[PDB]
C-alpha cells in the first residue's frame, strides 16, 4: 500500500495520452502494412524468448516502433532494422544486461551491418526525442494485479498472454489506450479462469466501468478465439511453456456475458 500507487497510477494515466501513436498511421505508410507489422512483432516475441528478455522489454519495443512509424515512412526492406533498433533500445532501458549489438545483428541472419544497426538506434532516439519511459499494457496489468482476491497465478499468466496478443494486430488495437486494453485483458482472463469479473476497486480506482470496457472486450475475445488460427504463433508457443502454466491451451469462453 505505497503513498504513491495512486499518484503513479494517475501519472501513468496522464503519461499515456502523451505517448499515444497516431491511430491511422499504417494507412499512410506507402510501402508497409499491418500484416508486415504482425510479422515483425511475432519475430520480436521469439527474439525475446531466445535471449530471455523480460516481457516489458517487448512492450517497450512495440511502442517505439509504433511511434516511429507514426511519423517516418519506412520501406519494407528497412522495417526489420527499425525493429532491431527498437528491441535494442528497449533492451538498454529495461534490461539489467542487454545482449550486445553483435547478437542483435546475428538474429537477423547477418542481414544488416552492426553499423546500420547502431545508426538506426540513433535515428530512433531522435525521432522519439529520447522519450522512452512509455506506459504499456504490461505496466497497467501489474498495477491492476495488486487489487485481486485471492491472487491467481493462472489469471495473471493468461492476462499477460492476452495483452501480448494485442501487440500483434495494429487494427483494432491502436484505437485503445494501454490502460483500457489491460482492463479488457484483466477481465477476460479473470472471467476465463474463474467466471468472476472486473472488480469494483478497479472500477473506482480507474473510473472504467465494465460497460466502457466493452468495445475492447469484443475485440480481445475475437482474437482469443481465432488465436490458434492466426498466421503468427510465437506468443502461443511462448505461453505453452509451463513457466506460464500452459494457459494458451486453456479454453476460451464462447461467450462473454457482456
Amino acid at each position: 500500500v505505497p503513498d504513491y500507487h495512486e499518484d503513479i497510477h494517475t501519472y501513468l494515466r496522464e503519461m499515456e495520452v502523451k505517448c499515444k501513436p497516431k491511430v491511422g498511421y499504417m494507412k499512410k505508410q506507402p510501402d508497409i502494412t499491418n500484416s508486415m507489422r504482425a510479422i515483425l512483432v511475432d519475430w520480436l516475441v521469439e527474439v525475446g524468448e531466445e535471449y530471455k528478455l523480460q516481457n516489458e522489454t517487448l512492450h517497450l519495443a512495440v511502442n517505439y516502433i509504433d511511434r516511429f512509424l507514426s511519423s517516418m515512412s519506412v520501406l519494407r526492406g528497412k522495417l526489420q532494422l527499425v525493429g532491431t533498433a527498437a528491441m535494442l533500445l528497449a533492451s538498454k532501458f529495461e534490461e539489467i544486461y542487454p545482449p550486445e549489438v553483435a547478437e542483435f545483428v546475428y538474429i537477423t541472419d547477418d542481414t544488416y551491418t552492426k553499423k546500420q544497426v547502431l545508426r538506426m538506434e540513433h535515428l530512433v532516439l531522435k525521432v522519439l526525442t529520447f522519450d522512452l519511459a512509455a506506459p504499456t499494457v504490461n505496466q497497467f496489468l501489474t498495477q491492476y494485479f495488486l487489487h485481486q482476491q485471492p491472487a491467481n497465478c493462472k489469471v495473471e499468466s493468461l492476462a499477460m498472454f492476452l495483452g501480448e496478443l494485442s501487440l500483434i494486430d495494429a487494427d483494432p488495437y491502436l484505437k485503445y489506450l494501454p490502460s483500457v486494453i489491460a482492463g479488457a485483458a484483466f477481465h477476460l482472463a479473470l472471467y476465463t479462469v474463474t467466471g468472476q469479473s472486473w472488480p469494483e476497486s478497479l472500477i473506482r480506482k480507474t473510473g472504467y466501468t465494465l460497460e466502457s470496457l466493452k468495445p475492447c472486450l469484443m475485440d480481445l475475445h475475437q482474437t482469443y478465439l481465432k488465436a490458434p488460427q492466426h498466421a503468427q504463433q510465437s506468443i502461443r508457443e511462448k505461453y505453452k511453456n509451463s513457466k506460464y502454466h500452459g494457459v494458451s491451451l486453456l479454453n476460451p469462453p464462447e461467450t462473454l456475458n457482456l
Partner: peptide, 16 residues
Amino acid sequence: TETEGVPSTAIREISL
C-alpha cells in the same frame, strides 16, 4: 558508433 552505441546509462538518465 562501431562498439556498442548509445550507452544505457545515458539512455535512462535522459529519458527520466
